[PDB]
Amino acid sequence: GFKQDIATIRGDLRTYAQDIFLAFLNKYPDERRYFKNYVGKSDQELKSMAKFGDHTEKVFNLMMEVADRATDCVPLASDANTLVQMKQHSSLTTGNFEKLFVALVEYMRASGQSFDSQSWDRFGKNLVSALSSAGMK
Ligand code: HEM
Ligand SMILES: [C-]#N
């Protein structure tokens, strides 16, 4: 289930973080424009770029912490608040996060590894609701 999925992702955080983030950028090319230093780079080029590894690591570690602190895939309002108030997220709208979770769920469904993809979709929906409540446009 969802709790096991957090363990699966955490166990190989670098591979899952990089692969899911790449799936997101590749499914929604306009999203890459927010990450000025990943423009014009292939998947394999990014996988040897230290900054890319560090960024994806930190993003997915935080995502997993928010997921772990959720109850029944409902994230804490305080965690949603953290995400809205980060200066790095100042220009974002809920649609950016929607796209990330659509890509994440698609990745999980396509994977040979078992995932509770339905629950990640629900988690993403609940997170979008919480981001909106916390002031994201
Ligand atoms: C639950 C989902 C998300 C989480 C947990 C998250 C988390 C983070 C974290 C921890 C950082 C700073 C890490 C570092 O030092 O590199 C960061 C930076 C950033 N985030 Fe997110 N993020 C999420 C979604 C998004 C989305 C959907 C976008 C845009 C489509 C976005 C855009 C950015 C940008 C442009 C930065 C600065 C780039 C950089 O760190 O060099 N984030 N995010
Ligand atoms: C940040 N993604």
Side-chain angles (χ1 to χ4, degrees):
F2 185 78
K3 288 299 204 184
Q4 174 52 39
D5 294 347
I6 297 168
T8 296
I9 293 168
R10 282 184 166 150
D12 195 352
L13 188 68
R14 278 224 160 199
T15 305
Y16 286 114
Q18 291 180 342
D19 293 347
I20 294 164
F21 183 69
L22 289 167
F24 168 59
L25 296 186
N26 294 334
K27 185 174 188 58
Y28 301 106
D30 282 11
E31 300 295 287
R32 187 179 296 247
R33 298 167 182 175
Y34 290 99
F35 305 91
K36 58 199 167 192
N37 297 133
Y38 314 141
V39 170
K41 280 129 191 170
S42 70
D43 292 2
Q44 196 55 47
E45 292 171 333
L46 291 168
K47 290 178 179 174
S48 72
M49 182 190 291
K51 172 63 176 183
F52 177 86
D54 182 65
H55 173 76
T56 59
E57 285 269 307
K58 288 175 160 55
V59 170
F60 276 74
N61 168 61
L62 180 54
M63 192 193 292
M64 292 309 100
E65 293 178 320
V66 173
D68 213 14
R69 285 192 290 265
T71 299
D72 301 346
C73 302
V74 183
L76 295 170
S78 55
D79 285 333
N81 202 200
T82 295
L83 296 166
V84 174
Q85 293 306 306
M86 282 167 61
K87 63 170 198 303
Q88 305 99 311
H89 292 166
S90 294
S91 71
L92 306 182
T93 62
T94 62
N96 297 107
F97 294 79
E98 176 71 11
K99 286 174 185 66
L100 175 59
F101 286 90
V102 171
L104 177 149
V105 169
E106 176 185 71
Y107 168 92
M108 287 181 173
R109 293 198 165 121
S111 73
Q113 171 66 52
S114 60
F115 282 106
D116 196 346
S117 60
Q118 188 195 89
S119 291
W120 290 90
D121 190 307
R122 184 157 52 85
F123 176 61
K125 280 188 181 283
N126 294 335
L127 186 60
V128 166
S129 294
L131 294 168
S132 181
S133 173
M136 185 171 287
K137 294 182 175 195

